[PDB]
């Protein structure tokens, strides 16, 4: 439990570490006494307990702030059909269209994960690393959050060719087989690319277009809907909305992975 700890003698008072363990024991048992908190938003849960696509309501999407679009002065008129209206100097996104597009994109992610494809979560804004990493880990996928190197797809040999690759079974179990140099030097291309900030990742979208990689993205009021295969109308500048949508997609991918493993284990 807590090795390399030297308890104190009964005559002497508690030590700092003994006090820490005493307070930990208190916290895990009695600190939570008196009431149970209900109907309160805790940000971390948005990453760790995302809802299923079918359980999402318009109220839940509005609570996450998905509806809040860009300023009316920065409007991209090609996004007219996704807009419910304008309010307080900003455009409001139609959350029913958002719900439909999000369910469709979640089905796409679930199908791709169930087929064993490679899913890449690209988001390069400040505090998006946590959700991206968790989505990649629970979908058995991959993620980028520092910077998208241009040419990562169209120039894969000169960018990603040096990093190591791995053969795996139907159950995602390492086989530890030795790969030939030609096999190691092939391009490994994502089967699905999801972008949280498509406005700042035009290079990735264009590379996916050139390389025929279907792509999902959160299309804000100032973003181009036609640059992506499966747009999701929603707010991309709020971390809560981005994490909510990303958690939904990641849970869909996890469900697909679980279905794949269940079928392989029967």
């Amino acid at each position: 439990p807590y090795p390399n700890l030297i308890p104190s003698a009964n005559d002497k008072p508690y030590s700092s570490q003994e006090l820490f363990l005493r307070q930990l024991n208190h916290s895990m048992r009695t600190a939570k006494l008196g009431a149970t908190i209900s109907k309160v938003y805790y940000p971390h849960k948005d990453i760790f307990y995302p809802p299923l696509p079918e359980n999402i309501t318009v109220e839940s999407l509005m609570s996450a702030g998905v509806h809040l679009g860009q300023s009316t002065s920065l409007w991209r008129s090609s996004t007219q059909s996704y807009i419910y209206g304008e309010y307080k100097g900003i455009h409001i996104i139609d959350l029913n269209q958002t719900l439909s597009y999000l369910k469709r994109a979640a089905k796409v992610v679930e199908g791709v994960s169930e087929s064993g494809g490679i899913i890449l979560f690209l988001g390069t804004r400040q505090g998006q690393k946590r959700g991206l990493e968790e989505a990649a880990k629970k979908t058995h996928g991959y993620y980028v959050s520092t910077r998208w190197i241009p040419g990562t797809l169209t120039n894969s040999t000169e960018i990603s060719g040096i990093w190591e690759k791995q053969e795996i079974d139907s159950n995602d179990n390492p086989t530890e087989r030795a790969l030939s140099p030609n096999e190691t030097s092939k391009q490994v291309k994502p089967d699905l690319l999801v972008v949280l900030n498509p406005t700042e990742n035009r290079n990735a979208l264009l590379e996916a277009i050139k390389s025929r990689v279907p792509t999902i993205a959160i299309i804000d009021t100032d973003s181009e809907p036609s640059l992506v295969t499966y747009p999701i109308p929603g707010n991309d500048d709020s971390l809560r909305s981005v994490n909510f949508l990303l958690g939904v997609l990641a849970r869909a991918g996890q469900r697909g992975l679980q279905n794949r493993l269940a079928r392989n284990n029967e």
Binding site: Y41, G117, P214
Partner: protein
Amino acid sequence: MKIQTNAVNVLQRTSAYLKSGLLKETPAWYNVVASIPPSTKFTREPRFKNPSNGHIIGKLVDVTEQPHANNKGLYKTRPNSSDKRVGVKRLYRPPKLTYVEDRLRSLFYKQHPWELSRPKILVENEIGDENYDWSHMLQIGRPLDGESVIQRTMYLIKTKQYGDMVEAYDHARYEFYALRMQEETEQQVALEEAEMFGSLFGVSAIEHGIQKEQEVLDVWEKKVVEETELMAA
């Protein structure tokens, strides 16, 4: 930007590659994208109704609909200039959303500016979970704020307990005053009881402000003496 063709037709390009023989193995996404067609229409859609207030867009009242005179006393006999202009832009603009509450709210914080100082949390918790009966102002899971006053005003008007906006607004205001007086008395009495029973408080708001003022004033002292010395020469 032009509406982009290549992003949504990846399936067609990949199918051509596969059937031609240029690509030997189907991508893992091929079957999924085939099962779920991308939406390939990017059209500006007309809007005929403003959801916020229900105003109907795209309606013209014909001459026949007026068999009587208008306020100036004139019958409408021919269309005027504004009626004879095509209004497609009205259909295709996103409608502005207007709510009655937005007015009363602006009144309330004008009538009670210091209510603004009470902090507000814009993090939504869960909107769908709200279960409120507005026969009374206080709601569990909600603070007591001016928005409660506007909500009670709308509830009063909806049930037609009162007729005019002003009357319901005043009634909700007086309920608000009673409740806030009760809370203020609880706070004062609680602090008095704490001091009555031996509670000791390290710092108070006045002393905290005095401390911050002291730091700022010491820095200002140094800067002013230095600046006077600089300016004198």
